[PDB]
Amino acid sequence: LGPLQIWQTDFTLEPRMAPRSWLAVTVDTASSAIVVTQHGRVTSVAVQHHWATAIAVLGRPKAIKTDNGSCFTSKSTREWLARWGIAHTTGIPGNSQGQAMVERANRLLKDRIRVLAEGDGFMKRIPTSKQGELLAKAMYALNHKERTPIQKHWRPTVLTEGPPVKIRIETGEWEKGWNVLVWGRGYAAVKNRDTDKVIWVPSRKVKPD
Amino acid sequence: PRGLGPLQIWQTDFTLEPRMAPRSWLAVTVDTASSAIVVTQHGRVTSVAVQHHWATAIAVLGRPKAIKTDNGSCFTSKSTREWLARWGIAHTTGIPGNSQGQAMVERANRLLKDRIRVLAEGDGFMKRIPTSKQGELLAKAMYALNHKERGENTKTPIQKHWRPTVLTEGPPVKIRIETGEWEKGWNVLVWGRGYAAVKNRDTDKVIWVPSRKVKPDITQK
């Protein structure tokens, strides 16, 4: 189990999004987070463009598993994945470890593009202008509103305090049990985990655990 | 001003990166709280650009309660206004001269562009960047400025964005009041490098003050 360890990339065709109607879809098997990018033609530079992107939005995944399409089997693409430490897995187009996680992403994605499309009247092909914006809006509904992927691979939570530190006590040794709150003008506000005491210490006398 | 937590207040603004031409017009949005960044390439600064930009930043960081940009036509425009309002996002215009604290973004631009310099010259493009590995490079720049801490810090913007640290109480400070004297009774909530959110111990009032006007209140209790 776990986010950013295994992804399922795959291209799909959405006519409504042409010219660039070739859609690259990456899904995180764990989080269920989606990343799609438009393309004129499914090629090696396409996938590599797509992935670099999904990496910027979801993070570096340990491995991606795609079909045996030339765009993934290619030389460049493999050198690429290897230049990033990303394991690759060309599974047969049926199941081969399961690959229907993405196809439901495509359905949700395309179906979503249908409503966002006809919502603004475009009963067919979508204007090259409001194309990115509509696609982008689909990502936001697919990832932020409950049906949550980001609320699953990000794990949003508010932290009441900061990271644990070891401050330097008058004896010259470094004492554990403190946590840093705020930094200001070279001093650090630190809070003792046992007494709840808060004191300001020089940045120099504070080091992490 | 700045935000005391993610998706509270954003600072959008366009910049010019020659190396990224044709589409050398860059739209950059920063989360004043998180310090997370999102940039998108553009051929020309327009209303559909901003709205393209924002839609995207929203997909990556989430829906922000408000964005504060300058008086550029692309933001003051009709569509843009109707757009922000169709999203429930408050808007706030200012002066291009970084007016007040909209300088949080200017640092984004510098870090971004400087970052594109290295990633550029690293692969040899000592000048203009080929239309092909353009997105790629840009994207890699986001990944560095987001998923990897930057400067003195232990957490990355992407981390402080979904797992923000919002203080309950906050340590004591002495802020400089209008008389020039340093007043006690205040505690710092967020201590930016630009401004600090500070809370009165007596009235519970919260106001933003220049970081230079606040100092640690070493007078332990």
Swiss-Prot record, chain B:
Residues 2-165 form the Integrase catalytic domain. The chain holds residues 1332 to 1552 of 1603 of the full protein. Residues 171-219 bind DNA. Mg(2+) 3 binds at residues 13, 70, 106. The core domain contains the D-x(n)-D-x(35)-E motif, named for the phylogenetically conserved glutamic acid and aspartic acid residues and the invariant 35 amino acid spacing between the second and third acidic residues. Each acidic residue of the D,D(35)E motif is independently essential for the 3'-processing and strand transfer activities of purified integrase protein. Binds 8 Mg(2+) ions per integrase homotetramer. Zn(2+) can also be a cofactor for the nicking activity, but not for the polynucleotidyltransferase activity. This is Integrase. Signal peptide: none annotated. Its cofactor is Mg(2+); Mn(2+). Catalyzes viral DNA integration into the host chromosome, by performing a series of DNA cutting and joining reactions. This recombination event is an essential step in the viral replication cycle. Has a strong preference for using the 3'-OH at the viral DNA end as a nucleophile. Homodimer; further associates as a homooctamer.
